[PDB]
Design a protein around this ligand. Structure first.
Ligand SMILES: N[C@H]1CC[C@@H](CNc2nccc(Nc3ncc(C4CC4)s3)n2)CC1
Length: 292
């Protein structure tokens, strides 16, 4: 059953051992589903990132199929590129493009972005979500650790370990998948749910960027899940330290009623996103830049 599951994965990953073509593996990070190293391609000296995920250590093993099939050849500007997947021992390795500037999380916990920078982030995420959502692709793990930056301050979405495929004919999902604090309420109450959860989650990430943490962060995960289910959408604490455009934008995102919650393609037309700075307005936020 392990052995069966390993066999099935072999059939969908690229053949070969990537240790043949890659060196200098160095752990630089962790997810729930596994670890992240950097490596270097033998032939060219180019750098890549590599997710290793132990097949025996997953909360839900079969999710491991999602990323490797769904993003197989997909190539958007605001999405991280997957190059290749391999099965190495009892681990799945996914070779990806390496992003220099690290994740949004580091920025959101060490500093308070202005609204131009916040817009820049949301604009980029939404582009990604527009194209993705239109292909029946739910990410289901939008949060600040899923957002990566280039050294020049461009923004890409990552962490497709939890994504899903919907279709015209079979519409909703019901499974409880995500990171608790960022979960949409209908997902928590395992009612039929769809793309719109990503929009809610982006809502929470906007509260991360403003208040420094998602709602209920101080609480244990299972309780928090219950609380998001039972309560009404969370309000900003910094109500007055923010602008009408942003507040307006937020209220389109943090709607309980999925049917009334906005869509990505809608939200691109939102005026708030017209404050979005260029890539270069993100760069002073990065670890290497903000402390002199
Ligand atoms: N849970 C996440 C895991 C990735 C990341 C941790 N490490 C990290 N630190 C600095 C730069 C960097 N760049 C990457 N480029 C591509 C990357 C591919 C998707 C893993 S990670 N990664 C942020 C927390």
């Amino acid at each position: 059953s392990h052995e069966q599951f390993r066999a099935a994965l072999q059939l969908v990953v690229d053949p070969g051992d990537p240790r043949s073509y890659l060196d200098n593996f160095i752990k630089i990070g962790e997810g729930s589903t596994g670890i992240v190293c950097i490596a270097t391609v033998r032939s060219s000296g180019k750098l890549v990132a590599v997710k290793k995920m132990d097949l025996r250590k997953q909360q839900r093993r079969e999710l491991l199929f999602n990323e490797v099939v769904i993003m197989r050849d997909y190539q958007h500007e605001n999405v991280v590129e997957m190059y290749n997947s391999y099965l190495v021992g009892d681990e799945l390795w996914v070779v990806m493009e390496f992003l220099e500037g690290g994740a949004l999380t580091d920025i959101v916990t060490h500093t308070r972005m202005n609204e131009e920078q916040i817009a820049a982030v949301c604009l980029a995420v939404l582009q990604a979500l527009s194209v993705l959502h239109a292909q029946g692709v739910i990410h289901r793990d939008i949060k600040s650790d899923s957002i990566l930056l280039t050294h020049d301050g461009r923004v890409k979405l990552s962490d497709f370990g939890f994504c899903a495929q919907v279709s015209k004919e079979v519409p909703r999902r019901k499974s409880l998948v995500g990171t608790p604090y960022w979960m949409a309420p209908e997902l928590i109450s395992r009612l039929p749910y769809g793309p719109e959860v990503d929009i809610w989650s982006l809502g929470i990430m906007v509260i991360e960027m403003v208040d420094g943490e998602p709602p209920y962060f101080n609480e244990p995960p299972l309780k928090a899940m219950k609380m998001i289910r039972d309560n009404l959408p969370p309000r900003l604490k910094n109500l007055h330290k923010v602008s009408p455009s942003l507040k307006g934008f937020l209220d389109r995102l943090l709607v309980r009623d999925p049917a009334q919650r906005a869509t990505a393609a809608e939200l691109l037309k939102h005026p708030f996103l017209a404050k979005a700075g260029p890539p270069a307005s993100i760069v002073p936020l990065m670890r290497q830049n903000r402390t002199r």
